[PDB]
Design a protein around this ligand. Structure first.
Ligand SMILES: O=c1ccn([C@@H]2O[C@H](COP(=O)(O)OP(=O)(O)O)[C@@H](O)[C@H]2O)c(=O)[nH]1
Ligand SMILES: O=c1ccn([C@@H]2O[C@H](COP(=O)(O)OP(=O)(O)O)[C@@H](O)[C@H]2O)c(=O)[nH]1
Ligand SMILES: [Mn+2]
Ligand SMILES: [Mn+2]
Lengths: 300, 300
């Protein structure tokens, strides 16, 4: 299976593989009265968001029932360019007005549960460079087929340091069953509303890993599938921010495993000059504050 | 202090700094009947080891009482080239014949406690490219001065991903007091025999971080100093091995913090081709087996 795999192919828990042979029209037939929402979280991606929407556009009013951009505080042209591309833009305020806003990606995805209605929600990063139009159908495939699958995680090929050095080694240490997950931190994935609204959402960059572990702990490995997305292009992370991202992944995973995190942010020491004559001290925030299951706030 | 610092300058626990103004001859006078051993662990570094010894050579029979290369299973010309450079080569077998050998750096450093005699032991990696001749005196300075200092950690400028993304964020999470340590994984450091023989030694690449945490837990922050080594050149780590190194750092730190590690090695999935058609599954070993305090085996 891993010795021969294609963009679309599905990996299940019991080491078994599947190469899908359906059309998108056949997949919409498999729905059986289930609705699909696509949510694109966006903080300042005016350059790429149009192209991302365009890749998913033609599925709307067919496979996809709604396409939402969750505007996470953008001050560029994200909103207007997303509207011109034919997406409904919902701000964090509009999504859930009765709860004060916290910073970070986790917050945005959590709020999008209140703004969306689909029985199935698909998340796709809005900074992807020319995403394959088959991303969404490939992600929903294993949910619409039905093996008691509740979370579909993607894997892909680089055309991350935090994934390979932090998330995956800590998973081996603390949740070794999740060692089969190739890309635990990836932003392209799909899940049932059932699962999503029943679990807490980790803050900031902890969100994906928290969901992964929460899904595993509550529903076991059989509820998780992996799908090959093929080549995944996206804008590279600036090197400065990787320490902060790692620290948050660590905080979220420790908390899921019942290990007390100090709540103390990473302090980085940045050499000011070539000789190392002076260092700039930079401390990034880390959060231990999950949001509760959406069922406790805005229940269906 | 961090806003103005020089190779040699010392950082203590109470945020206080020190710029040393002694000669190496004045430092040998400060000894007061204390012996200093330099230990160079070496697994296949025939190209660099001569130069490393040459940088420390002139201190022998003066500041340094003995200079030992701990040969960790070399099959190149490490031994003969280290002898020609004027170092005493001791194999892992010769160091401690009554205990079976385990693989890894930790093993080598632990055995070197049995092969060396100095009241103070200085460790220096043998793959350093043209190390500054003042490395050893800069490392022993804070021990010979006396503030109840038992461990001297170096920091330096790149002319690591695992340090910045794994070791330092996990320290903030689990031992936030150790957040002030710039280079927790560095191989250039000095300590008393007193401390070194009283603590367990972590296996493989866990060794430095284990010592750091063990020192902190038992003697507190005041027993640890940091010294600026300046620019530190060394051969770059091949990218493949970084996952394995991270996994071991994780295992060692978790164990020091009382957190159960699964003992399950990191499995890496290596794309065999550009499309991501097939993956090679590669699982690196991780060890949870410390060596006990040398006092329990070969006591002074
Ligand atoms: O506070 C935030 C930060 C990120 N994002 C969005 O979440 C996705 C992932 O963000 P980023 O690209 O920085 O994360 P990475 O690729 O490094 O995992 C992108 O579409 C961002 O626009 C967001 O909505 N709110
Ligand atoms: O099993 C081992 C592996 C490493 N080394 C030595 O320990 C030092 C650090 O090894 P390496 O350069 O691979 O570690 P890194 O610089 O990546 O921390 C070097 O002098 C190696 O020759 C050793 O004695 N035994
Ligand atoms: Mn991105
Ligand atoms: Mn090295």
């Amino acid at each position: 299976g891993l010795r021969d795999t294609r963009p679309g192919d599905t990996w299940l828990a019991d080491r078994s593989w599947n190469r899908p042979g359906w059309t998108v029209a056949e997949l919409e037939a498999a729905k059986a009265g289930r609705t699909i929402s696509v949510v694109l979280p966006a903080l300042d991606e005016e350059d790429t968001i149009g192209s991302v929407i365009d890749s998913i556009s033609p599925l709307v009013d067919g496979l996809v029932d709604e396409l939402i951009v969750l505007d996470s505080g953008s001050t560029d042209d994200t909103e207007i360019r997303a509207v011109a591309a034919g997406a409904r833009v919902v701000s964090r305020e509009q999504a859930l007005p009765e709860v004060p806003i916290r910073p970070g990606k986790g917050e945005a995805l959590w709020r999008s549960l209140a703004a969306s209605r689909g029985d199935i929600v698909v998340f796709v990063d809005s900074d992807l460079i020319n995403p394959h139009p088959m991303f969404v159908p490939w992600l929903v495939g294993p949910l619409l087929t039905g093996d008691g699958v509740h979370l579909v995680k993607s894997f892909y090929r680089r055309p991350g340091r935090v994934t390979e050095l932090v998330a995956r080694p800590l998973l081996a240490a603390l949740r070794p069953e999740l060692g089969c997950i190739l890309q635990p931190l990836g932003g392209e994935y799909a899940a049932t509303r059932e699962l999503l609204t029943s679990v807490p959402f980790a803050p900031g960059y902890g969100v994906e890993i928290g969901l992964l572990v929460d899904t595993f702990d509550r529903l076991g490995l059989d509820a998780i599938a992996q799908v090959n997305l093929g080549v995944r292009e996206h804008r590279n992370r600036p090197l400065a921010e990787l320490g902060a991202m790692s620290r948050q992944v660590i905080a979220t995973l420790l908390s899921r495993c019942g290990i007390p995190d100090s709540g103390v942010g990473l302090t980085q020491f940045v050499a000011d000059g070539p000789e190392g004559q002076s260092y700039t001290q930079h401390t990034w925030p880390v959060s231990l504050a999950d949001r509760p299951p959406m069922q406790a706030i805005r229940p269906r």
